[PDB]
């Protein structure tokens, strides 16, 4: 779990739990739910 609370959520990037707690970040700017995070697990791994 590398998604600390350093930041809440980016624009059009909410998040909700599934049948259990699969925190998936919802995307309103693009309309889509994703497992990764739009503010920590995006196109960046340096």
């Amino acid at each position: 779990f590398e998604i600390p609370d350093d930041v809440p959520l980016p624009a059009g990037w909410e998040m909700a739990k599934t049948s259990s707690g699969q925190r998936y970040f919802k995307n309103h700017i693009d309309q889509t739910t994703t497992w990764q995070d739009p503010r920590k697990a995006m196109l960046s791994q340096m």
Binding site: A16, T18, Q22, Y24, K26, N27, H28, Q31, T32, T33, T34, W35
Partner: peptide, 10 residues
């Protein structure tokens, strides 16, 4: 492994 939810919006 599993696909994301069906998404929603109020």
């Amino acid at each position: 492994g599993t696909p994301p939810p069906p998404y929603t919006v109020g």
